[PDB]
Symmetry: C3
Subunit: 333 residues, 3 copies
């Protein structure tokens, strides 16, 4: 394959490596490296720990961005410091179980897979070693997403360009942390040691935690997402194992691809959209009002109580036409 090669420096979520939307480039081989890391992490503000398994150290794995007709060449590395075999499956790719059947690597090995980006949209990628290990590796954190843009950029299905000013990637993770008899979350010395209890819980289908970017509160405070009034923000949302229903509290989805695929026109003016487990979707919104927004899954129990809330802090001028407090709280006459 005699095409130009381009390296990408991946960046940790929720940020997204620099890329063009519309491009004059033709097909290239776009080179990415993912290095697997198994590690024990803290997942909530109480100090609960979790045996995570990750691409590039993060949950989710980083967003990869290419254009239709590019070839995506990934070097997947499984250092000898890990304990388990791993692989990678791209929902964007055609053949060999998405790549999984060509990428199984033991600790100490690496592999190089190339796939042609023939389908546009946002797509999940995840580890899938085989059998019961498939769900376990995924719900341990081994999932991310790839975006395959049209070469002319995004459009509204009516002939008009949609151009985003910035993009964020929100990866949602269902986590299954068992409890002891008295009701405290358990801690484990290794992923292998966590497996039996964790699988028992998994099969009951109810997560203990549902988080964005790997942790309760990850996308809040210093790490809130940001925008200004007038900016059009693309929010890519993935969930590799379990459904979600994103909602921007105080905003909308102006243009939404909930099934995540750019060969389809977006829907307009949504309140809440739906990410099928095993997929990525995307929503664009032009901010109109300053202040704090919450970005949630709109099962509010999961949002407020299990971890699945992000914030935006938005700068700009308040628009009293759109909303105003006519009378502040006062005693009832």
């Amino acid at each position: 394959l005699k095409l130009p090669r381009q390296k990408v420096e991946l960046v940790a979520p929720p940020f997204v490596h620099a890329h063009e939307q519309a491009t004059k480039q033709g097909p290239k081989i776009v080179e990415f490296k993912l290095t697997i890391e198994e590690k024990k992490v803290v997942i909530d503000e109480k100090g609960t720990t979790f045996q995570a398994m990750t691409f590039n150290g993060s949950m989710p794995g980083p967003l990869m961005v290419v254009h239709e007709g590019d070839y995506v060449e990934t070097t997947l590395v499984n250092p000898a410091t890990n304990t388990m075999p791993h692989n990678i499956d791209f929902h964007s790719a055609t053949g060999a179980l998405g790549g999984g059947a060509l990428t199984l690597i033991n600790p100490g090995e690496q592999v190089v897979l190339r796939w042609k980006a023939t389908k546009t949209g946002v797509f999940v990628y995840h580890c899938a070693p085989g059998g019961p290990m498939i769900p376990w590796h995924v719900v341990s954190g081994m999932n991310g997403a790839v975006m395959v843009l049209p070469r002319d950029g995004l459009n509204d299905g009516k002939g008009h360009a949609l151009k985003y000013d910035k993009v964020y990637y929100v990866g949602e993770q269902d986590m299954y942390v068992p409890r002891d008899e008295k009701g405290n979350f358990k801690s484990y010395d290794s992923p292998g040691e966590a497996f039996t209890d964790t699988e028992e819980m998994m099969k009951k289908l109810i997560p203990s935690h549902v988080v964005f970017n790997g942790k309760v509160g990850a996308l809040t405070g210093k790490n809130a997402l940001t925008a200004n009034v007038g900016e059009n923000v693309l929010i890519v949302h993935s969930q590799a194992n379990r459904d979600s229903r994103p909602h921007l509290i105080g905003g909308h989805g102006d243009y939404v691809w909930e099934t995540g695929k750019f060969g389809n026109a977006p829907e307009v003016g949504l309140e809440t959209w739906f990410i099928r487990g095993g997929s990525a979707g995307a929503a664009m919104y032009k901010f109109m009002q300053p202040g704090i927004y919450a970005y949630v899954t709109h099962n509010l129990i999961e949002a407020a109580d299990l971890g699945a809330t992000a914030h935006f802090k938005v700068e700009g001028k308040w628009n009293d036409d759109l909303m105003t407090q006519v009378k502040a709280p006062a005693e009832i006459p």
Copy 2:
């Protein structure tokens, strides 16, 4: 804001206050009042009780209907006879967490919020005080919906008007009533007293009851929904916290906006549609056959066993072309 003012007399669900579909009116300030009521109610035919919190005394809160570009001015009242702070968040509105950040009122207070109806469709509204109180107030009943109609009324996305002969609002409520050791549902003296047990159950994500209009069997018997053969009925369905899959048993969704937003064309000829938790959707059907219909969520366990069944009683002439019993039950030859 120098626009005409129009008061609306809200009516309890499943009915909907009188309104125009297509209108020659221009933008107005449309005035609504919602008075919060915390109250213990009965939710099933066994006499199980429930610590409800409501807008205007009902579950769901009443449907508000306006047109695109109207300004919706709501007086939210929290009488001193209530125990908790409350607010209101409109998914139809832009800014301040949908209004929640401008409407927090203690018992004995009221507040007046105005928002411009810039997005068409059906939308959830709900209380959202902050933090863990958000899901608790919602699943205690503090949710309803608003419909923002195009000024030209509804259309099919192909240039033709859809006009409904009547509209009903079905609000679905997931309820979390704990049980005692021997397995009976518990009763509580106050919402505050119900909170700890109720939150514990909430986080396990499985409701004890899933009801329409606040109670098992609410929309049956004397209170069945009604229609005649030839009538086009709009059914607005909301679920502020948890997914649902509406289905009209013996009918269809002729025109369905499952994501609920009129800037999108409806889908046609559905059997079952999907209401994302945190949203409202809408379906229109022209009745063709008389008799009883059931309107359900098509998780039939929730429909038949947890409470989520309504009936329609339809008058008119049976159509043997559409369906006929060729041979009544008989012994097998």
Copy 3:
């Protein structure tokens, strides 16, 4: 009704009786017979048993295929060897609870129902005797699907014919098998004897098993689905009670009707789609690569651990342009 009559020989899933896509035939009365069978079956590779209730002996019931405007005349037979009353409800039909209100038959009886196929798409049919029996009969296996094709065959919504080379019907079944105190699955002597424990479990909303074609591994091994590179395969997927999220691992949904209704254009290029509980949907894919594929629900816990995995074995030539292993696993430099 003076139309020609045509008998169909039904075939067991996942196969589909022979039919035309586009046809020059006009409306006919298409005759089907379904014979109910209650039977104890094995549902997993451990030998767990299950009190099934079936149409024609299979889970799912067989796929019925007709064209728009046909009249579907079904003889439903409930032999005296069964223990319970049964009926049939077609989501494709108009009136009488889909037919259920006209087809209730005791053991030893049969009934003949005709309905006009006025809505195109794939649709669930299921038993629905009344009250709590409704979910129980459905989740015991009493559900299948019917496909109502346009007379001109399928199209892409842009004026082009879609023609499938073969069709498979994947019926997904949520099953609720209780466990004893020590944690083993229970066995029962009759459906009636299984009812109390099974209903208790049902109302908690978590299945023990989620299977395709009635059993873990049913659509694997000798019974894997098959295709060749270049073949366009239609996959009809139904779920009468509970949501699913189909995904073809290593492939896509080239054209997908997730809500299942052919009056709507398909979506294109999906990774994962969504079958609402109480519905059928359909996806077409043209295979591009040989080898094994897994067809799953993409809650991977349900796929890998609860039973919901099928395989395709695909013959043909590997396409190194679409995907290639650039470097096989090797030691990290």
